[PDB]
Coordinates of C-alpha atoms and ligand atoms in Angstrom, one line a residue:
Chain A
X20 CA 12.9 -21.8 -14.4
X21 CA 11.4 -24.9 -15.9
X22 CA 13.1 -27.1 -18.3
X23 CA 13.8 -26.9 -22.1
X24 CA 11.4 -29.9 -23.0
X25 CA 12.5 -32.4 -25.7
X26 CA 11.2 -34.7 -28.4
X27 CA 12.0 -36.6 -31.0
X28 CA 10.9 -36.3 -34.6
X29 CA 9.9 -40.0 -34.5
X30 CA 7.0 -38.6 -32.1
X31 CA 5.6 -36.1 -34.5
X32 CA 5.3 -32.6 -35.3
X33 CA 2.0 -33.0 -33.1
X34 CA 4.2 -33.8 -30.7
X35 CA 6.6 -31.0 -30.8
X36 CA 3.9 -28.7 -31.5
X37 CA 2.5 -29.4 -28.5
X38 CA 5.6 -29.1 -26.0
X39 CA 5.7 -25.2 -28.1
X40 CA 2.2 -24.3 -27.2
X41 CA 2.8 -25.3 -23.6
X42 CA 6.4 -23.6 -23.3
X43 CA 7.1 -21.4 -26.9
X44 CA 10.1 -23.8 -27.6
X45 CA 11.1 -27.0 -28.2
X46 CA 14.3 -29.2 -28.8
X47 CA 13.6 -31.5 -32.3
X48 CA 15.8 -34.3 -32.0
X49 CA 17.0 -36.2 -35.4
X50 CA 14.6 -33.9 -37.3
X51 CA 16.7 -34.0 -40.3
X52 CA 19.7 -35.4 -41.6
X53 CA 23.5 -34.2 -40.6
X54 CA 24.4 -34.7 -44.1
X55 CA 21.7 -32.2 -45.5
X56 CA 23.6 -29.9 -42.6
X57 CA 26.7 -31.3 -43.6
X58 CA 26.5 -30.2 -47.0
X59 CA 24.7 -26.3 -46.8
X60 CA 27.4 -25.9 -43.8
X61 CA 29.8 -26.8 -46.6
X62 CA 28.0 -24.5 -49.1
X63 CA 28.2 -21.7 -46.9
X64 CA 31.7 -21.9 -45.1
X65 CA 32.8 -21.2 -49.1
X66 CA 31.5 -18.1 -48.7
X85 CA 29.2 -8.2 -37.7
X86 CA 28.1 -7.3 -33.7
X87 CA 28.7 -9.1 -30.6
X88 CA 31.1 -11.2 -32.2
X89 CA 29.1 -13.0 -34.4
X90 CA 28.4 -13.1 -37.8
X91 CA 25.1 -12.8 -39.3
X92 CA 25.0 -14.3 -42.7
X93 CA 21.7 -14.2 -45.2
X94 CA 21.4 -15.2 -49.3
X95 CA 20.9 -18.4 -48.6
X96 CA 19.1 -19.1 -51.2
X97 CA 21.9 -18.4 -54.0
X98 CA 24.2 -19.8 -51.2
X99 CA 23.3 -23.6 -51.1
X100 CA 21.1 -25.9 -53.7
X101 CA 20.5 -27.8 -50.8
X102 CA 19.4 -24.9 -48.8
X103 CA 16.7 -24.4 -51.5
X104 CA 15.6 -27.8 -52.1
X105 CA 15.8 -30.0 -49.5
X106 CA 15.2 -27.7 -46.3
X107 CA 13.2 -25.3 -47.2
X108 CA 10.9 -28.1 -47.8
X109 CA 11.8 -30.2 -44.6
X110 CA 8.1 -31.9 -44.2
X111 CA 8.2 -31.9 -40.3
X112 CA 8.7 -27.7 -40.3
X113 CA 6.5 -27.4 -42.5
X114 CA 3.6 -29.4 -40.4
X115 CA 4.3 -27.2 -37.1
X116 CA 4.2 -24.1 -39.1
X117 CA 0.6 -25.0 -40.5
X118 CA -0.3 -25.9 -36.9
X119 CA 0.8 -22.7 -35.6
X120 CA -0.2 -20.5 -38.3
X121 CA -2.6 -21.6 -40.6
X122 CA -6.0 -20.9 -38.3
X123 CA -5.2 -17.5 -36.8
X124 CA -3.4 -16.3 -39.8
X125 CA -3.2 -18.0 -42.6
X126 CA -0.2 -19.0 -45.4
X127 CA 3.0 -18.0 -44.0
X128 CA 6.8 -17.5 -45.6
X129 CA 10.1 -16.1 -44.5
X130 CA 11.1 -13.2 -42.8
X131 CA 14.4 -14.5 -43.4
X132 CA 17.2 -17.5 -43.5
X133 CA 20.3 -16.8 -41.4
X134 CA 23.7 -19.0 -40.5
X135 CA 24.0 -17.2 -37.1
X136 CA 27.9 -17.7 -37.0
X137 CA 28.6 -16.5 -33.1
X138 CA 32.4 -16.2 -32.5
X139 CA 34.2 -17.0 -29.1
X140 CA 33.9 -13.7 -27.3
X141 CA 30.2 -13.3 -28.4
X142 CA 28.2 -11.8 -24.7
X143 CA 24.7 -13.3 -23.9
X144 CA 22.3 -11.4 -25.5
X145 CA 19.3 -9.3 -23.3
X146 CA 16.6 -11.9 -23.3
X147 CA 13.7 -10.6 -25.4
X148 CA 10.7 -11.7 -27.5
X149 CA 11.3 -11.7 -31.5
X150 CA 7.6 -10.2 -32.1
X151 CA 9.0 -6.7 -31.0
X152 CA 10.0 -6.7 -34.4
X153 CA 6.6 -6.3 -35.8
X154 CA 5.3 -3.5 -33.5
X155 CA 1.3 -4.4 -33.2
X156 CA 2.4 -6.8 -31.1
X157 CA 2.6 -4.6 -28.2
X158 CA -0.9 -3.8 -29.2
X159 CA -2.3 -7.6 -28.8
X160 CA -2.8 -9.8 -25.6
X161 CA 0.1 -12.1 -26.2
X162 CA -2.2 -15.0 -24.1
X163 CA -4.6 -14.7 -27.1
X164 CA -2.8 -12.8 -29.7
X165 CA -1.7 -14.3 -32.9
X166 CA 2.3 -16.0 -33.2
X167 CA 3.2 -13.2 -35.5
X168 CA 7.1 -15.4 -35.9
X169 CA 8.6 -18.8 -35.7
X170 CA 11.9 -19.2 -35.3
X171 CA 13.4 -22.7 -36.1
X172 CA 17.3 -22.7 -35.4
X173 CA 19.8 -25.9 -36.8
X174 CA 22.7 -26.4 -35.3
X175 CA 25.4 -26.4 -37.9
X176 CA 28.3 -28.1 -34.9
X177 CA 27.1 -28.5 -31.1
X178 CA 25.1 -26.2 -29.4
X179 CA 26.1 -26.6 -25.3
X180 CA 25.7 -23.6 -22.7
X181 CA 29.7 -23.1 -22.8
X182 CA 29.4 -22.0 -26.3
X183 CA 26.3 -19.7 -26.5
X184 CA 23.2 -22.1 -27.4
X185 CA 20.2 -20.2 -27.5
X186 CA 19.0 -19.2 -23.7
X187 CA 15.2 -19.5 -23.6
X188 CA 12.9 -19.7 -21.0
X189 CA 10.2 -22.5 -20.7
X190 CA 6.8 -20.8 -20.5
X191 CA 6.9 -17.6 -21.1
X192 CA 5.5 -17.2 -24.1
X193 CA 1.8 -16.4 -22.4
X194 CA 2.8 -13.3 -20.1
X195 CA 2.1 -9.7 -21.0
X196 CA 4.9 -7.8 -22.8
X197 CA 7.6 -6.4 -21.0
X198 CA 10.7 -4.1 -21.8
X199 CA 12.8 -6.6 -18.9
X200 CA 12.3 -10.5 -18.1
X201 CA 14.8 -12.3 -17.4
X202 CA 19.0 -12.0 -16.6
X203 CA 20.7 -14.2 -19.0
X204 CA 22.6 -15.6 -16.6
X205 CA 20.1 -17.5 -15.0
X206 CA 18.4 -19.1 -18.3
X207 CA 18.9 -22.7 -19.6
X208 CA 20.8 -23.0 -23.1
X209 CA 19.4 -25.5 -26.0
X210 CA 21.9 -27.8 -26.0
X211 CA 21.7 -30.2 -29.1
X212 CA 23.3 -31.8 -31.8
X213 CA 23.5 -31.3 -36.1
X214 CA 20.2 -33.0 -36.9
X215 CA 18.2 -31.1 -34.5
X216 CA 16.7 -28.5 -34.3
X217 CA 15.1 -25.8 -31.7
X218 CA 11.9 -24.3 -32.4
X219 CA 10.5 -21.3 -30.6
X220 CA 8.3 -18.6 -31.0
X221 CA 8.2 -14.7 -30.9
X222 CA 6.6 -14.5 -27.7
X223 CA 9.6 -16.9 -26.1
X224 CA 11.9 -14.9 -24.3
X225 CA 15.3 -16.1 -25.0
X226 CA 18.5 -14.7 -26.4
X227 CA 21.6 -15.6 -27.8
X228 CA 24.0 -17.0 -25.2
X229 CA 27.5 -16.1 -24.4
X230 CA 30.0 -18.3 -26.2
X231 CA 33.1 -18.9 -23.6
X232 CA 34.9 -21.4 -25.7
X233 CA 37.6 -21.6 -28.5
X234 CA 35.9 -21.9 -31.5
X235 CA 32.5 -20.6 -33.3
X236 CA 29.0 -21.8 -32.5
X237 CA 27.3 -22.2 -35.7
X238 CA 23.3 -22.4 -36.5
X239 CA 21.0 -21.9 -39.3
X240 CA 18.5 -19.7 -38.2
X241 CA 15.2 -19.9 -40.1
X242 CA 12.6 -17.2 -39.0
X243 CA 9.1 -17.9 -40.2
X244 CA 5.7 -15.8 -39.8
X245 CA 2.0 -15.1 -41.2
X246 CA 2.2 -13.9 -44.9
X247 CA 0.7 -10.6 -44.1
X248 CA 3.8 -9.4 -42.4
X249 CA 6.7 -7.7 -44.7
X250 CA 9.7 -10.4 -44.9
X251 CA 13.4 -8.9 -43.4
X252 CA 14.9 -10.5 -46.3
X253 CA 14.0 -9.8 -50.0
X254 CA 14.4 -12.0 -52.4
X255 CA 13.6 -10.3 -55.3
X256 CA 17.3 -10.5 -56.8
X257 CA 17.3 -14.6 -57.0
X258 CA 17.6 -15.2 -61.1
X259 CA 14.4 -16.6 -61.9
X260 CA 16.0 -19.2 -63.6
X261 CA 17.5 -20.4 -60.2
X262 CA 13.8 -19.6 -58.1
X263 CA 11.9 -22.2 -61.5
X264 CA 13.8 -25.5 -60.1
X265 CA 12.3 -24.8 -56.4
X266 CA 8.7 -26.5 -55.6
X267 CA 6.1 -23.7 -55.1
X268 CA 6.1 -23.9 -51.1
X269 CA 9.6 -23.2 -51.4
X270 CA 9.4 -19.9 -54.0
X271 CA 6.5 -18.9 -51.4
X272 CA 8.5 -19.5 -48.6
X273 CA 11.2 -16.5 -50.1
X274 CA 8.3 -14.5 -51.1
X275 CA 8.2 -15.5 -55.1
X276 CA 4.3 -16.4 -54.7
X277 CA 1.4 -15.6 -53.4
X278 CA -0.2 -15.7 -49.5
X279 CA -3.7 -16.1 -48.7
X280 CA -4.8 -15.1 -45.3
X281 CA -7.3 -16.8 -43.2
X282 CA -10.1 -15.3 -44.6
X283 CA -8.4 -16.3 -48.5
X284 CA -7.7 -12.9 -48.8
X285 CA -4.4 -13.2 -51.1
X286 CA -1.5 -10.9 -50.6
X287 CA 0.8 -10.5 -53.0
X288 CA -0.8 -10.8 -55.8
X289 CA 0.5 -9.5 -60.1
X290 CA -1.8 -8.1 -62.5
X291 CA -4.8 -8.8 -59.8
X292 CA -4.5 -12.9 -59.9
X293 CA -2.1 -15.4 -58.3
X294 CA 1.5 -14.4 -58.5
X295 CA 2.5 -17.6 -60.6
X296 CA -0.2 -17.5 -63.0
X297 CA 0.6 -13.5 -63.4
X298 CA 4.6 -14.6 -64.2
X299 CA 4.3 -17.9 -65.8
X300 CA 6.3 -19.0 -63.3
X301 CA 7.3 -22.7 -63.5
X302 CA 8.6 -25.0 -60.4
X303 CA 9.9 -28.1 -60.2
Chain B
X19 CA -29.3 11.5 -36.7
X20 CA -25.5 10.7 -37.3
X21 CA -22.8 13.2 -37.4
X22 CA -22.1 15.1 -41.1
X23 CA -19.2 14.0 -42.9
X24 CA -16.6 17.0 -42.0
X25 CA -14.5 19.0 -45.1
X26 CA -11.8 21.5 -45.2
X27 CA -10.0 22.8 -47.9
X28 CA -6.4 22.0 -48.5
X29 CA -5.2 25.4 -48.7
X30 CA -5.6 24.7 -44.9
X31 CA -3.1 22.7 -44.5
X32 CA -2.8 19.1 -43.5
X33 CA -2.9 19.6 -39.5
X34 CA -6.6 20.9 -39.8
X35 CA -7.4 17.3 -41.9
X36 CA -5.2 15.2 -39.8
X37 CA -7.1 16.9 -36.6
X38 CA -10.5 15.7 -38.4
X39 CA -9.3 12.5 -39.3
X40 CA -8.5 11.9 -35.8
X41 CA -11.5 13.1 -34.3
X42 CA -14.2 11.6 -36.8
X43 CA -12.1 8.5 -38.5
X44 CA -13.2 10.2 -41.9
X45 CA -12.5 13.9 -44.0
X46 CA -12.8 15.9 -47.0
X47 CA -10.3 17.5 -48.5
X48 CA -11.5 20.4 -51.1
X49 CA -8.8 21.2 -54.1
X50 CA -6.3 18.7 -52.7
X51 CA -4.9 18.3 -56.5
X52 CA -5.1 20.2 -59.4
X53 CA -8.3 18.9 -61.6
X54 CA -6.4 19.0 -64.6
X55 CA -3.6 16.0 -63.1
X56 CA -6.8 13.9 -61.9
X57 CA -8.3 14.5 -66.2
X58 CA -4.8 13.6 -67.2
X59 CA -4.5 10.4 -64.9
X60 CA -8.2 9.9 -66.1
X61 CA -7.1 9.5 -70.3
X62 CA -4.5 7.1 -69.2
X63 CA -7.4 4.8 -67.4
X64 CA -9.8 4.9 -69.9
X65 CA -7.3 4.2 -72.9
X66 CA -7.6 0.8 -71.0
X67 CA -11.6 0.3 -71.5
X85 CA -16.5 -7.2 -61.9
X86 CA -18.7 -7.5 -58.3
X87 CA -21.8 -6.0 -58.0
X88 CA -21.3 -3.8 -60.7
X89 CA -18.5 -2.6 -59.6
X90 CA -15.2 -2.7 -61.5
X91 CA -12.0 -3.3 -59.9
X92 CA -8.6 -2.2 -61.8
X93 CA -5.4 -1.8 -60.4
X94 CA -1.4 -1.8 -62.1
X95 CA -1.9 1.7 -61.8
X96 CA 1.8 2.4 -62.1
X97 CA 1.8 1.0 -65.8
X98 CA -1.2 2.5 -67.1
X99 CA -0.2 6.2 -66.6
X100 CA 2.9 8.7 -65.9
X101 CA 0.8 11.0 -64.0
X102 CA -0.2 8.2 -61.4
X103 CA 3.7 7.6 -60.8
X104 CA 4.7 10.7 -60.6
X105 CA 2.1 13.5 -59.4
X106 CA -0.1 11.3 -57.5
X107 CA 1.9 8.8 -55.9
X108 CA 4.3 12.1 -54.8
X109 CA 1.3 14.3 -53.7
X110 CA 2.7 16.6 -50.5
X111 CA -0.4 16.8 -48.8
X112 CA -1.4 13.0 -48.9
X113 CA 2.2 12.3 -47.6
X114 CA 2.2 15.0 -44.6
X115 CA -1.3 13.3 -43.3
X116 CA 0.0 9.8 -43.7
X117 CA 3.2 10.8 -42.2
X118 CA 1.0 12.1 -39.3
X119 CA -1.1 8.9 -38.9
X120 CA 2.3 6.3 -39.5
X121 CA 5.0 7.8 -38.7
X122 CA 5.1 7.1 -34.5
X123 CA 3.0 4.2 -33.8
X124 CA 4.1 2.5 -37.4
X125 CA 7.0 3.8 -39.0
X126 CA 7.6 4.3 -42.8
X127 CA 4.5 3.1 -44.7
X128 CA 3.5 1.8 -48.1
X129 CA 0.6 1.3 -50.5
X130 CA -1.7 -1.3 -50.0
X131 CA -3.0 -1.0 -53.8
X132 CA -4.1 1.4 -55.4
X133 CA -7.3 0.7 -57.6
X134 CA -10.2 2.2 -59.7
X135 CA -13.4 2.3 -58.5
X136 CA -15.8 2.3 -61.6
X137 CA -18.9 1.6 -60.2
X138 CA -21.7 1.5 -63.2
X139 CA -25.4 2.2 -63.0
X140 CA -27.0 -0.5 -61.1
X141 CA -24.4 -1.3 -58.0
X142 CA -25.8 -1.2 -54.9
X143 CA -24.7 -0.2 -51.2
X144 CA -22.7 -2.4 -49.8
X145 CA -22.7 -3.5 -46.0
X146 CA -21.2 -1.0 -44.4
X147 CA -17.9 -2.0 -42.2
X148 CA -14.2 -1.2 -41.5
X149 CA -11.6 -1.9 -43.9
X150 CA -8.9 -3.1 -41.4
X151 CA -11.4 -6.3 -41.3
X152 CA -9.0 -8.0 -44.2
X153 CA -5.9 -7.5 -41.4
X154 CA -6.0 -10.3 -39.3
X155 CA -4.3 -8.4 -36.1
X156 CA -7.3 -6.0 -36.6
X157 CA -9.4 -8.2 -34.4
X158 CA -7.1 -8.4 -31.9
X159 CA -6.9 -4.8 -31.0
X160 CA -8.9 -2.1 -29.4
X161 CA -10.2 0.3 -31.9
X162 CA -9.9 3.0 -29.3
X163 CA -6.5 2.8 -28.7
X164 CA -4.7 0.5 -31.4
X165 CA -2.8 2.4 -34.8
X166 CA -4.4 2.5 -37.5
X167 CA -3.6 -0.3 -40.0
X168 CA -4.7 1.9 -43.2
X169 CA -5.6 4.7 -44.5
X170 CA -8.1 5.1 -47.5
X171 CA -7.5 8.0 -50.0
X172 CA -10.3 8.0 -52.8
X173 CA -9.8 10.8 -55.3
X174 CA -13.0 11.2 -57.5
X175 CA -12.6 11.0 -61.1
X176 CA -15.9 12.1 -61.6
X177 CA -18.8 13.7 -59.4
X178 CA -19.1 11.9 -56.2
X179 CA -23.1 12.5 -55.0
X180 CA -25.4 10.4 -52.9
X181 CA -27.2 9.3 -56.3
X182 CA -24.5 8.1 -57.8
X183 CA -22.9 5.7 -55.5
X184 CA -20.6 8.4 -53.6
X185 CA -18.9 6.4 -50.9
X186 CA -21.2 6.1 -47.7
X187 CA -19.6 6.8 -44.4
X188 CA -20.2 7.1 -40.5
X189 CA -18.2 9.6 -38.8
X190 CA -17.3 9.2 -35.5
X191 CA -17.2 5.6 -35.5
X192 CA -13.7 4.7 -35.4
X193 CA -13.3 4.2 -31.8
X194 CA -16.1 1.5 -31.2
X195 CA -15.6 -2.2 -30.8
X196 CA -15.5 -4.4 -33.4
X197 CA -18.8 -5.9 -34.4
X198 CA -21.0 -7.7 -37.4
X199 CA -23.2 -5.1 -37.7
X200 CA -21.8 -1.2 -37.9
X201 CA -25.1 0.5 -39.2
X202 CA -27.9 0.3 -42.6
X203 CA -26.7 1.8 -45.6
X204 CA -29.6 3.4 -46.2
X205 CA -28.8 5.5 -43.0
X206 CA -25.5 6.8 -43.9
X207 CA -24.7 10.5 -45.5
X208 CA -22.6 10.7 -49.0
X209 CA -19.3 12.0 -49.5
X210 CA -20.2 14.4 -52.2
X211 CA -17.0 16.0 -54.0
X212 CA -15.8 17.1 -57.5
X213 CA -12.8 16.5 -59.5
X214 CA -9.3 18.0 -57.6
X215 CA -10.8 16.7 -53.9
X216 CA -10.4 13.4 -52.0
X217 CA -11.7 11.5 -49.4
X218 CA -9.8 10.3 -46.9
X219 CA -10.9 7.3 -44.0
X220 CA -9.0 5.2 -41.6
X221 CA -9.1 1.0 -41.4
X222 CA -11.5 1.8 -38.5
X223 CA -14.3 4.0 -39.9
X224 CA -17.0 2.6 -41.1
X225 CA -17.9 3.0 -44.6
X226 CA -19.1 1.4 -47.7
X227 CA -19.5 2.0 -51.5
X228 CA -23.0 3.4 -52.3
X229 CA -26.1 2.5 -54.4
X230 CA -25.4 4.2 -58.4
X231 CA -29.0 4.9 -58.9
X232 CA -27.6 7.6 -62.2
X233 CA -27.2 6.2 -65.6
X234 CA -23.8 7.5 -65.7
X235 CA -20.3 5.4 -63.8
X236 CA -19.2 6.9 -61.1
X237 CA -15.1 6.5 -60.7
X238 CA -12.8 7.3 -58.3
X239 CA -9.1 6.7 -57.6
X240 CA -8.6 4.8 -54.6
X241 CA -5.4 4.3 -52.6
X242 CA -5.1 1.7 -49.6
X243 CA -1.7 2.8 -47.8
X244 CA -0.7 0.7 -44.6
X245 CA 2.6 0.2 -42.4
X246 CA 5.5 -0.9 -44.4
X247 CA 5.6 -3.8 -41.8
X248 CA 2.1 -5.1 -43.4
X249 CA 2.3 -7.3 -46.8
X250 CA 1.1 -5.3 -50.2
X251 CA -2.3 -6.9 -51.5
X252 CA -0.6 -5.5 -54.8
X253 CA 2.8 -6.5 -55.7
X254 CA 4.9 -4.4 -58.4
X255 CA 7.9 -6.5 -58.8
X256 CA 6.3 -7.3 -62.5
X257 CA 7.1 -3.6 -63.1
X258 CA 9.6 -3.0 -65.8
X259 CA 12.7 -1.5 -63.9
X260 CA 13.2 1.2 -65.8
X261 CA 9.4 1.9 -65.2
X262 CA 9.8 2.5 -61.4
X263 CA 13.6 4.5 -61.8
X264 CA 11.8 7.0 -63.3
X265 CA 10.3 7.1 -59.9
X266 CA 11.1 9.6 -57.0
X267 CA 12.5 7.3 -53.9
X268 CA 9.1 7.9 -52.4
X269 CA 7.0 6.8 -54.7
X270 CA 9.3 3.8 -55.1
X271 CA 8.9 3.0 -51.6
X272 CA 5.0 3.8 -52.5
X273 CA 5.0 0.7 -54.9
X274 CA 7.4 -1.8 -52.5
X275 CA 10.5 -1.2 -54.7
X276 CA 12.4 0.3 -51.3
X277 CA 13.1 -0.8 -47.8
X278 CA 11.0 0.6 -45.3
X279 CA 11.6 1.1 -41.9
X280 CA 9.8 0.7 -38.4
X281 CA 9.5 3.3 -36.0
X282 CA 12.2 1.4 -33.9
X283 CA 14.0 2.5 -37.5
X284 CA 14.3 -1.4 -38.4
X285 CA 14.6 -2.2 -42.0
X286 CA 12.5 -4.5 -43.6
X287 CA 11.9 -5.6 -47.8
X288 CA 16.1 -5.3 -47.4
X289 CA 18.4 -7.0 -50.1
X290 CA 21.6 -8.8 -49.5
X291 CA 21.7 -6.7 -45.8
X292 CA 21.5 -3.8 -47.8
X293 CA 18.7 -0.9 -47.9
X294 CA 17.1 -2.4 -51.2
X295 CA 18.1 0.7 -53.3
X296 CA 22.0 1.0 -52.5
X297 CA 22.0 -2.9 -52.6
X298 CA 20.3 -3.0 -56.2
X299 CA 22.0 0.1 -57.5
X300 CA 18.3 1.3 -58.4
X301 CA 17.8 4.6 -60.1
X302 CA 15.7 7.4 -58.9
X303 CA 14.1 10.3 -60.3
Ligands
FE401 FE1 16.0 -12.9 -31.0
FE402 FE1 -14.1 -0.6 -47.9

């Protein structure tokens, strides 16, 4: 199989957005500091299947998870890029430490956009990325521990119910500060982690407004969602989305969800 | 000339309109709800009296108790969505749900599909692709072709997309009274008609889609003891529920939960 293509976010979110278009993934090197890591690992180790934990509530979770990733300007650029013209806005299906304990067996490599199931009903070489995944490692990601199998280039083929053996996929190997980015039509799965302790990664899942969010957010204390900027309260569904013909989803009393709440950011 | 917008009567159960619906994109359904729910849900929306003289109003769930509770439970709307959603989709929810008052004056609009506003729609062949949404207009007053009555082309829910579906001036009139409703698909091609009649014409419209598909009309403004005076369906109706794919996985979920065991929410 080809090769898990790297870049660092010196080069660009042009630049990594143009490695996922050609492949469905990318590795992000030094695309935000460890110590912003650092400290929402630290927020959540405070606080299952396949031996591995799935963990969500970020957003109560970690201030740091609300302020200064959600609003991590080099995500934010490749989502526009790979949303805004055949979709539109775009927020969360949900935020997710992916906690995979030794133990944990390779998942069956699949694409994410099963999910959502008018994919099946779309050309995936012309359809609309219906979900972006960005993944931070929260320690190191290596194949020996169970970073993320993918495979280069397959994000363009028809949809399948088999495509590849895990065994014989590459794992994103990579470092706190980076991160992976792929999309719903990259096959890939979780890999199998052999070693003695936990691989950890933050697991952001991103997609077109005009798909239902996994994750509610609707139990946040407003107080708490007011000192978040408004991409952010977008992001975990407290505003409204426009698609790309403007029409707005989500939408109180018939206008824009923050004028409809008074709601105030920061 | 184009085909005649088919009806059947309720009391003939929702197979016979689901069959219609399939074959023609667009149905009738005579004495689908008792006339006197439809005056009382009718009270409650003028007690609370703009494009092309046509009136937009939605927050249906606050204005009246009969919306929340007969309408938004009615059996027979439920069976036919169930037989639409249920396989290709999964568990679905409303869209919106909005008054149509269109006043003396408005004229036909283009007509076109509704699934247009869904990005994916394009994407899809009509012929084979789920539908995206179904349209349930109940008339609040006489529907007839004079008055506006919603224009509509049956059988044309299978052809390709396209910029041009047909001339209003071409199309036959869903023509119903009080206690019947009008049921079309994302696909069928449609559009509000010309009110030459002194006199609004005003119907109840509900837009239900997959619960995988974004409300236009979010209800998290409603007061919460509002919506648990709500059955767990028409919770769902309003987004205050999860709701499930046909591969049976959960989405609008709280804290890993299903949204009501999570928020301890009430039901009717
Ligand atoms: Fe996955
Ligand atoms: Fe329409």
């Amino acid at each position: 199989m080809p090769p898990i293509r790297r870049v660092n976010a010196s080069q660009g979110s042009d630049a990594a957005y143009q490695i996922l278009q050609e492949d469905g993934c990318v590795i992000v090197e030094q695309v935000i500091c460890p110590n912003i890591i650092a400290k929402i690992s630290d927020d959540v180790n405070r606080v299952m299947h396949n031996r591995t934990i799935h963990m969500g509530d970020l957003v109560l979770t970690s201030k740091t998870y609300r302020d200064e990733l959600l609003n991590l300007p080099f995500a934010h650029e490749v989502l526009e890029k790979v949303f805004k013209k055949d979709s539109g806005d775009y927020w969360l299906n949900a935020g997710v430490i992916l906690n995979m304990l030794p133990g944990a067996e390779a998942q069956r490599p699949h694409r994410d956009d099963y999910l959502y199931p008018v994919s099946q009903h779309m050309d995936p070489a012309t359809s609309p990325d219906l979900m972006i995944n960005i993944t931070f490692p929260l320690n190191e990601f290596r194949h020996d521990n169970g970073g993320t199998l993918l495979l280069p280039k397959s994000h363009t083929g028809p949809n399948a119910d088999f495509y590849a053996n895990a065994e014989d996929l590459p794992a994103a190997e990579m470092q706190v500060g980076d991160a992976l980015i792929f999309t719903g039509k990259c096959v890939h799965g979780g890999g199998a982690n052999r070693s003695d302790k936990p691989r950890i990664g933050l697991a952001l899942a991103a997609q077109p407004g005009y798909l239902t969010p996994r994750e509610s957010n609707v139990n946040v204390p407003r107080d708490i969602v007011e000192t978040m900027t408004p991409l952010a309260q977008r992001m975990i569904g407290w505003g409204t989305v426009r698609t790309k013909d403007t029409y707005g989803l989500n939408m109180l009393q018939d206008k824009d969800f923050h004028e409809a709440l008074g709601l105030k950011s920061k």
